[PDB]
Design a protein around this ligand. Structure first.
Ligand SMILES: CCCCCCCCCCCCCCCCCC(=O)OC[C@H](CO[C@@H]1O[C@H](CO[C@H]2O[C@H](CO)[C@H](O)[C@H](O)[C@H]2O)[C@H](O)[C@H](O)[C@H]1O)OC(=O)CCCCCCCCCCCCCCCCC
Ligand code: CLA
Ligand code: CLA
Ligand code: CLA
Ligand SMILES: CC(C)=CCC/C(C)=C/CC/C(C)=C/CC/C(C)=C/CC/C(C)=C/CC/C(C)=C/CC/C(C)=C/CC/C(C)=C/CC/C(C)=C/CC1=CC(=O)C(C)=C(C)C1=O
Ligand SMILES: CCCCCCCCCCCCCCCCCC(=O)OC[C@H](CO[C@@H]1O[C@H](CO)[C@H](O)[C@H](O)[C@H]1O)OC(=O)CCCCCCCCCCCCCCCCC
Ligand SMILES: CCCCCCCCCCCCCCCC(=O)OC[C@H](COP(=O)(O)OC[C@@H](O)CO)OC(=O)CCCCCCCCCCCCCCC
Ligand SMILES: CCCCCCCCCCCCCCCC(=O)OC[C@H](COP(=O)(O)OC[C@@H](O)CO)OC(=O)CCCCCCCCCCCCCCC
Ligand SMILES: CC1=C(/C=C/C(C)=C/C=C/C(C)=C/C=C/C=C(C)/C=C/C=C(C)/C=C/C2=C(C)CCCC2(C)C)C(C)(C)CCC1
Ligand SMILES: CCCCCCCCCCCCO[C@@H]1O[C@H](CO)[C@@H](O[C@H]2O[C@H](CO)[C@@H](O)[C@H](O)[C@H]2O)[C@H](O)[C@H]1O
Ligand SMILES: CCCCCCCCCCCCO[C@@H]1O[C@H](CO)[C@@H](O[C@H]2O[C@H](CO)[C@@H](O)[C@H](O)[C@H]2O)[C@H](O)[C@H]1O
Ligand SMILES: CCCCCCCCCCCCO[C@@H]1O[C@H](CO)[C@@H](O[C@H]2O[C@H](CO)[C@@H](O)[C@H](O)[C@H]2O)[C@H](O)[C@H]1O
Ligand SMILES: CCCCCCCS[C@@H]1O[C@H](CO)[C@@H](O)[C@H](O)[C@H]1O
Ligand SMILES: [Cl-]
Ligand SMILES: [Cl-]
Ligand SMILES: [Fe+2]
Ligand SMILES: [Mg+2]
Lengths: 37, 35, 334, 342, 51, 81, 34, 63, 38, 50, 30, 35, 36, 34, 36, 31
């Protein structure tokens, strides 16, 4: 019941979302040919 | 093909003319300091 | 004012989200044309007789390629350097067989990218900036011109231009090695020094600035929050960074002048890549890498191979196999 | 100070022209020997017994063609120590067996460790964060993957790279013809981090130099800067607007910008290292199976991928007999792959 | 084993504030790592030996 | 500013040159002679232009035996004379 | 083309799992008190 | 904080946070064990490498 | 037995100890002779 | 592969450990005497002021 | 199915370009 | 004012400078070797 | 403390570098490594 | 069993897409100033 | 100036659990037919 | 592959039961 004082909020700003979606999508565009083989 | 060529010729001429007249339209003056 | 005057004011506005400008008036349509043709060809174009020997090569996704194997294939060796616009073809079907899209794309792209470079000068002048970012971009641009225009001109054919595709690019590299011994050319070696050194100094600079950021945040926050867009104060301690790097090597090997440091950062890769571009552009006229094949000979006259001769054997493998149905006579002269 | 340890620490850490440190004890002798071993071998030492090649200025090679070459394939992965079972303390024989190769590779590996310990030691004394040492893990991952792991996965050190300009060129071409290494997505990520790093190096240097504040009267602008000045030397606000309008996006955070400049080339080198660990096992991206099944059944199907394997097959057949002398290959003319005429 | 470890994880997550984890002098969370090393090293030695 | 004498002091001083106008040339000449005497070949085991192949020998003296490679090279070398 | 039948699902999840991770983190950041 | 039976039993094992021996304490004996361990690793490496070849030690599948 | 490679092993080991020993002898000696001023 | 990647994790955490005090950045009042050559006789030691 | 996948990823990336340019976090001075 | 001659720097310089000149003499001699 | 001007030391030194590298280029065309 | 080769991708996306929609909404509700 | 028609959106924990139960049980029901 | 899929879905459902019961939003009298 007592609150844990170690808890912290987490953030991902908009630029970071865009940078991360770019990483993921480009990695997928690169690796997908190998996955289809 | 003839129509296409004439079309593209017109399009290109149109844009080249914008570039040339554009740069003729007092370009040096278009800056933030001395005009 | 009149329509023209307002138009000019709009074209040259420093207020547009994307700067237009007079270079942009040419750049926008040419880049759009190259992009659209490229995307459609890369997906859907039929096979292209790159080497003019009625042996069509499939570049597109729908005709059995993946992202890595796909390409827009260069125009036919039968065409050579002849200008092959759509209206020179009897049909779109013929245009497609002969690799018309390649010419359309690369001519629009080269014009558009040259205008991109002009536009960089243009905006810098509108903003009261110094003007030479466009000179830094001349290095990649020169390199694109070398592989898509100068090399084909030297060799007499756009069929020897770099293909617009990932595997095509490697094909161009390997054939270029067989034909010019590029690795043994000092301008390509300077290009390697330019790009490996650019990577190196990129990492070095990133790490030295990052290492001396001034404490402005707590351990929970990203340190990036310690900098605010547009603040006047520098966000790291250059004297600290120089203090570190001068000791890593020796004092006079390190910059304490940020202007000299950033000039070096610009210059090293830009100059190396200009030599890369000039390497391709002069091997275009067959002034080729150093040839030390059989350079070391013993007292009798036996050839004593060096690593150069082992290179030569790999080059021979590339040479004898490439375009395996296209040569009828014993020398590959272009 | 206190005791001898602390007096040693004092002296090791004196502020001098060339800083020493505790790391210096490892770094200096290892770097010196790796470099001197290279200059020694390239100037004086043959590779006749190991490769059938001349490799030194003494034999007539030039700066491009000299190398310290790998040991013979029959040496396996011998440490090939001067005092080991192969050379048995004979310096001349050790040279002729390729002992300078493992000498340079191993002192070089310890030297790089010492160099990175140097970056940590100096950072700690000056009170900076150790990101330079961290960035240097990318050079270490490359050196270790290519010069140690790669040959350790293969039959012998013979297949490691030899230390020389042309010798390294040969190593590239071998990797193309045998591993199709250009097809490998870890190499492609390496290439992206190298060219993208060189791109960021150029574009960030040019942007700073072209958004400078007028801080002097000189038309040569380098004097108009002071290391101690509080103020940014160039306008982040103007640089941001310029690129936002030219390219569509721009940095706005200088701290992010500089961390990204560490990130890109460091990450790219680490990715290339992983692909090379796979090549140690011949675990290649050599083929696309769907391409081969189609091309085997359809003799009119051709892509740039099928074209490049034909080049690889030429490279293997034409280069192997001289490049792999211990195999005693004899390939009669009639079996060599060749297209028409050439 | 997986199932039991998952349940223990739940208990330890909820009942995180055990006095065992508090430095008796300061009331601050504290783990005495040097002694944990000997305890774990001793156990690892025992298991290795018995294996 | 770490203490040592500045390099540009040292290399423009008469005394530096008195010492080095002798040490530099002496080292250079010793390197020359290390080659011109032939000594370099024997220290490092590098073939002379007449010692890569015996007169009629077909193939290269490749080392093929890890633990008796030293002996192999020794036998390879008498098979020249 | 005779592709690997698991290529599709491998590609789909490769994109979706970390993209959704990021989207979840972005949206709950935006919804935190202005 | 919450006391439990087991936590009370284990309490002494987690009660010396920060406790040190004076000065260098056992550092020199540590160094000796580290040296001997370096030498041990060198030995096992040279045996696997065939750099150190020992009577009755045939490093191969076949004895 | 002491095989010829075990003898080489001891020689390598001895050589290393000597390079390290002399290196540390010299460095300690020089640090003692040339102290920083506090 | 994982062994090589764990080398990075080692370097990273070893760094975080030895450099905890500057994790958010370096001292904003860092003395320019501490990074300049020859002020101190021993790099980074105020007590060896020359 | 593979062509569809490759073109789908590509289309997502072009969409991403659009949001990253025109719906970026706007830079604000200070 | 009054400088030491032999320093860590001095040693660093000669570990490199000394073999460099010796090597350069060796390589110059090599240019007159004929097969 | 100087006596020989730095610009002379540089010029002589630079000329010495040119000579030795020139010699090395000469040697690419004569003797060993010359292909002849 | 010769199942439909799209059944796996269909099921996975059927599960993943709406579940992720609910997770996004739940987590950004929790992060709202309470 | 901001759009005053904007509103926060919510999904409480019980609704998350209800929803995930709906989705997983529908997938458990339909997956057989998808594989066929 | 089908068996894995069905068992996976089932397993997720049981996991949900656990969270729905032990990590429910606790009922509280507004008091
Ligand atoms: C991170 C960065 C940190 C910075 C690091 C800096 C570097 C420090 C320096 C370390 C040097 C290590 C060298 C190891 C040499 C080696 O291995 O030498 C190899 C020997 C094995 O010898 C080989 O063994 C082979 C197989 O033989 C066996 O099989 C044969 C055929 O059947 C016969 O039966 C034979 O009798 C039997 O021995 C062949 O004989 C080879 O010729 C012979 O070289 O193993 C051995 O010494 C030891 C093997 C066990 C330990 C390996 C740990 C280290 C290497 C890890 C990398 C692995 C690579 C995997 C590829 C991915
Ligand atoms: C810090 C400096 C340093 C380091 C890390 C190395 C590291 C190495 N050297 Mg290099 N070397 C150095 C300085 C160094 N060297 C210097 C200054 C010289 C000029 C003398 C050389 C000249 C040299 C040569 C000529 C060779 C090497 C070789 C080697 C390798 C094998 C070394 C070995 O097995 O030692 C084993 C010894 C130790 C690890 C010392 C251990 C100390 C322990 C803790 C105590 C030992 C006490 C012992 C019980 C008492 C004596 C033994 C008794 C039983 C008889 C290794 C890469 C070899 C190589 O590169 O082959 C390819 C090789 O042939 N070195
Ligand atoms: C667009 C062209 C391109 C680009 C940009 C790259 C880029 C890269 N290549 Mg690829 N390559 C290409 C085309 C390209 N390649 C093609 C067409 C092929 C044919 C298949 C190859 C074949 C190839 C191979 C075979 C290898 C690469 C590797 C690499 C990486 C080398 C990283 C590095 O700096 O190592 C340089 C070395 C280090 C960083 C180690 C540390 C060096 C220390 C710090 C040096 C210290 C020196 C000292 C101070 C003084 C020296 C003395 C002096 C006299 C010299 C990098 C990702 C390598 C890689 O993947 O490694 C994992 C590699 O092995 N490439
Ligand atoms: C690039 C290599 C590298 C670098 C820069 C670092 C850097 C660091 N190490 Mg790590 N470490 C490494 C590799 C490295 N390590 C390796 C390969 C191991 C073995 C698994 C370790 C094991 C280790 C531990 C257990 C710890 C560190 C710690 C540290 C930190 C303090 C410095 C230190 O302890 O140095 C260590 C010194 C060295 C890496 C140099 C060793 C030189 C050896 C003795 C030379 C041997 C010569 C050899 C015998 C010759 C024969 C060769 C043979 C092939 C024939 C720092 C972050 C400590 C830490 O994080 O504190 C918070 C810590 O606790 N290191
Ligand atoms: C066992 C025994 C004997 C032990 C004894 C050990 C002992 C005590 C020895 C002492 C004696 C001793 C010292 C002997 C010496 C031995 C010896 C000679 C060893 C050889 C060492 C060796 C091979 C060294 C390699 C040479 C080397 C490191 C060359 C570096 C070359 C190079 C490119 C330098 C960079 C120069 C340059 C123009 C840099 C700018 C580029 C750059 C980093 C930009 C980024 C950047 C820079 C800044 O500047 C600042 C500011 C910021 C912001 C920034 O972004
Ligand atoms: C004073 C202090 C100096 C301290 C130097 C520190 C030591 C490290 C130096 C490394 C130098 C590496 C190059 C040596 C080249 C050489 O000797 O060629 C020696 C060769 C010898 O010439 C050859 O000799 C043979 C004799 O049998 C034959 O005649 C061959 O035909 C002939 O080519 O000369 C050349 O190849 C000509 C060009 C050399 C140009 C090299 C460019 C180097 C660029 C690489 C970057 C390294 C930077 C070094 C910094 C200094
Ligand atoms: C010659 C071209 C190479 C130098 C400049 C090219 C880099 C451009 C980078 C992008 C713009 C980067 C940028 O904006 O730079 C700006 C930077 C400083 O600008 P300033 O306005 O202070 O100086 C330039 C003029 O206004 C004159 O004062 O420029 C220079 O320092 C020019 C130096 C010329 C030095 C003389 C000629 C060059 C010699 C160097 C070449 C030697 C290498 C040969 C070995 C292979
Ligand atoms: C001309 C001024 C503008 C340039 C400043 C911008 C920096 C550009 C970077 C230039 C590239 C580097 C060349 C520096 C050259 C330079 O720009 O400045 C020249 C500099 C000034 O000479 P001074 O007579 O003022 O020397 C003062 C000191 O000797 C007093 O301690 O002298 C040197 O440092 C070069 C001698 C190197 C001696 C080699 C010693 C061997 C050490 C080997 C180990 C090193 C450690 C590495 C491994 C850890
Ligand atoms: C190995 C060994 C060892 C060691 C040794 C050593 C340590 C050595 C060193 C050595 C050295 C240390 C050498 C050096 C050399 C150098 C040289 C040979 C140089 C050259 C240079 C040049 C030629 C230049 C060029 C150029 C450039 C670079 C740029 C500018 C222009 C020019 C072109 C001028 C011992 C005994 C321990 C043991 C066993 C083995
Ligand atoms: C199939 C792929 C699945 C990948 C799934 C990824 C799961 C991601 C879980 C992220 C959880 C974030 O967790 C969420 O953190 C926030 C802050 O960030 C907490 O929010 C807490 O702090 C914020 C911010 O000060 C307060 O406004 C709020 O009142 C408080 O409760 C939430 O109570 C918690 O639920
Ligand atoms: C195919 C290439 C075509 C070849 C054309 C040959 C050009 C040589 C003759 C130049 C005559 C044009 O003359 C030029 O025209 C433009 C457009 O009207 C003028 O008009 C402009 O004036 C001001 C100058 O600050 C601008 O801000 C304004 O937008 C514009 O109206 C220029 O001030 C005038 O100097
Ligand atoms: C493959 C499957 C992918 C499915 C993707 C589903 C995407 C669904 C997006 C949900 C968007 C929620 O949109 C989000 O609403 C919250 C409120 O709820 C807004 O938040 C707003 O209200 C909250 C609460 O009053 C304030 O603390 C906050 O400062 C304010 O901006 C966010 O600014 C917005 O980003
Ligand atoms: C090679 C260095 C590693 C060994 C470090 C162990 C230090 S050992 C330590 O040394 C002190 C002097 O510094 C002595 O006063 C003290 O009595 C002794 O126990
Ligand atoms: Cl081809
Ligand atoms: Cl022909
Ligand atoms: Fe910068
Ligand atoms: Mg010659």
């Amino acid at each position: 019941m007592e609150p844990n004082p170690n808890r912290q909020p987490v953030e991902l700003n908009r630029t970071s979302l865009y940078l991360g979606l770019l990483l993921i999508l480009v990695l997928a565009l690169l690796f997908s040919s190998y996955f289809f083989n | 093909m003839e129509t296409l060529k004439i079309t593209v010729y017109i399009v290109v001429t149109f844009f080249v003319l914008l570039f040339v007249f554009g740069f003729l339209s007092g370009d040096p003056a278009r800056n933030p300091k001395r005009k | 004012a009149n329509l023209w005057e307002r138009f000019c004011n709009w074209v040259t506005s420093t207020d547009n989200r994307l700067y237009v400008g007079w270079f942009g008036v040419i750049m926008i349509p040419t880049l759009l044309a190259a992009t659209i043709c490229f995307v459609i060809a890369f997906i859907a174009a039929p096979p292209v007789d790159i080497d003019g020997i009625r042996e069509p090569v499939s570049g597109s996704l729908l005709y059995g390629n993946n992202i890595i194997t796909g390409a827009v294939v260069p125009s036919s060796n039968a065409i050579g350097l002849h200008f092959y616009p759509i209206w020179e073809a009897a049909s779109l079907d013929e245009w497609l067989y002969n690799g018309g899209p390649y010419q359309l794309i690369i001519f629009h792209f080269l014009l558009g990218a040259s205008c991109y470079m002009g536009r960089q000068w243009e905006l810098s002048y509108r903003l009261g900036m110094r003007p030479w970012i466009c000179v830094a971009y001349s290095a990649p641009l020169a390199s694109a011109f070398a592989v898509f225009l100068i090399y084909p001109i030297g060799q007499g054919s756009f069929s020897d231009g770099m293909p617009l595709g990932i595997s095509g690019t490697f094909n161009f590299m390997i054939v270029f090695q067989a034909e010019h011994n590029i690795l043994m050319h000092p301008f390509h070696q300077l290009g390697v020094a330019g790009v490996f050194g650019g990577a190196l100094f990129c990492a070095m600079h990133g790490s030295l600035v990052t290492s001396s950021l001034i404490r402005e945040t707590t351990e929970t926050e990203s340190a990036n929050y310690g900098y605010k867009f547009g603040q006047e104060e520098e966000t790291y301690n250059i004297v600290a960074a120089h203090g570190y790097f001068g000791r890593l090597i020796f004092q006079y090997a390190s910059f304490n002048n940020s202007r000299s440091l950033h000039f070096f950062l610009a210059a090293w890769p830009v100059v190396g890549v200009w030599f890369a571009a000039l390497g391709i552009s002069t091997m275009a006229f067959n002034l080729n890498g150093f040839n030390f094949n059989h350079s070391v000979i013993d007292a009798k006259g036996n050839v004593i191979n060096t690593w150069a001769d082992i290179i030569n054997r790999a080059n021979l493998g590339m040479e004898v196999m490439h375009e395996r149905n296209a040569h009828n006579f014993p020398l590959d002269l272009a | 100070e206190r005791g001898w340890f602390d007096i040693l620490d004092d002296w090791l850490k004196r502020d001098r022209f060339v800083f020493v440190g505790w790391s210096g004890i490892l770094l200096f002798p290892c770097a010196y020997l790796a470099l001197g071993g290279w200059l020694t071998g390239t100037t004086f030492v043959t590779s006749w017994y190991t490769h059938g090649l001349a490799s030194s200025y003494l034999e007539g090679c030039n700066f491009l063609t000299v190398a310290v070459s790998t040991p013979a394939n029959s040496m396996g992965h011998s440490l090939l120590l001067l005092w080991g079972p192969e050379a048995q303390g004979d310096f001349t024989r050790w040279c002729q067996l390729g002992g300078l190769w493992t000498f340079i590779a191993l002192h070089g590996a310890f030297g790089l460790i010492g160099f990175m310990l140097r970056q940590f030691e100096i950072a700690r004394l000056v009170g900076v964060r150790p990101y330079n040492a961290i960035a240097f893990s990318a050079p270490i991952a490359v050196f270790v993957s290519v010069f140690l792991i790669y040959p350790l996965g293969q039959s012998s050190w013979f297949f490691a790279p030899s230390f020389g300009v042309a010798a390294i060129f040969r190593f590239l071409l071998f990797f193309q013809g045998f591993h199709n290494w250009t097809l490998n997505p870890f190499h492609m990520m390496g290439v992206a981090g190298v060219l993208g790093g060189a791109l960021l190096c150029a574009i960030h240097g040019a942007t700073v130099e072209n958004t400078l504040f007028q801080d002097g009267e000189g038309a040569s602008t380098f004097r108009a800067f002071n290391p101690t000045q509080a103020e940014e030397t160039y306008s982040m606000v103007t640089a941001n607007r310029f690129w936002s309008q030219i390219f569509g996006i721009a940095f706005s955070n200088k701290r992010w910008l500089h961390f990204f400049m560490l990130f890109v080339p460091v990450t790219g080198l680490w990715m290339s290292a992983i692909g090379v660990v796979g090549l140690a096992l011949n675990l290649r991206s050599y083929d696309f199976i769907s391409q081969e099944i189609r091309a085997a059944e359809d003799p009119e199907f051709e892509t740039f991928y099928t074209k490049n394997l034909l080049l690889n097959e030429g490279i293997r057949a034409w280069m192997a007999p001289q490049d792999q002398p211990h195999e005693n290959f004899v390939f009669p003319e009639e079996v060599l792959p060749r297209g028409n005429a050439l | 084993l997986s199932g039991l470890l998952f349940l223990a994880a739940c208990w330890h997550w909820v009942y995180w504030d055990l006095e065992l984890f508090r430095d008796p002098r300061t009331g601050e969370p504290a783990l005495d790592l040097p002694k944990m090393f000997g305890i774990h090293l001793f156990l690892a030695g025992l298991l290795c030996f018995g294996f | 500013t770490t203490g040592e004498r500045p390099f540009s002091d040292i290399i423009t001083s008469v005394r530096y040159w008195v010492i080095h106008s002798i040490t530099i040339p002496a080292l250079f000449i010793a390197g020359w002679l290390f080659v011109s005497t032939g000594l370099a070949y024997d220290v490092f085991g590098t073939p002379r232009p007449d010692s890569y192949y015996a007169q009629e020998q077909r193939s290269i003296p490749l080392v093929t035996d890890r633990f008796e490679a030293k002996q192999q090279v020794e036998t390879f070398l008498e098979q020249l004379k | 083309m005779e592709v690997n039948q698991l290529g599709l699902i491998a590609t789909a999840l490769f994109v979706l799992v970390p993209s959704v991770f990021l989207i979840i983190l972005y949206v709950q950041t935006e919804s935190q008190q202005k | 904080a919450r006391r439990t039976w087991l936590g009370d039993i284990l309490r002494p094992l987690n009660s010396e946070y920060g406790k040190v021996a004076p000065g260098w304490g056992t550092t020199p004996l540590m160094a000796v064990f580290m040296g001997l361990f370096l030498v041990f690793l060198l030995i096992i490496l040279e045996i696997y490498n065939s750099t150190l070849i020992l009577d009755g030690v045939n490093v191969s599948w076949k004895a | 037995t002491i095989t010829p490679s075990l003898k080489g092993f001891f020689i390598g080991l001895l050589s290393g100890a000597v390079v390290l020993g002399l290196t540390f002898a010299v460095l300690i000696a020089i640090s003692q002779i040339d102290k920083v001023q506090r | 592969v994982f062994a090589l990647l764990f080398f990075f994790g080692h370097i990273w955490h070893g760094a975080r450990t030895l450099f905890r005090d500057v994790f958010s950045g370096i001292d904003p009042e860092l003395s320019p005497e501490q990074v300049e050559w020859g002020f101190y006789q021993k790099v980074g030691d105020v007590t060896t002021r020359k | 199915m593979e062509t569809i996948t490759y073109v789908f990823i590509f289309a997502c990336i072009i969409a991403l370009f659009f949001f990253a340019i025109f719906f970026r976090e706007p830079p604000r001075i200070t | 004012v009054s400088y030491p001659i032999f320093t860590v720097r001095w040693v660093a310089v000669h570990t490199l400078a000394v073999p460099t000149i010796f090597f350069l003499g060796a390589i110059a001699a090599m240019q007159f070797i004929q097969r | 403390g100087g006596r020989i001007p730095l610009w002379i030391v540089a010029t002589v030194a630079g000329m010495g570098v040119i000579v030795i590298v020139g010699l090395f280029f000469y040697g690419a065309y004569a003797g060993l490594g010359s292909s002849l």
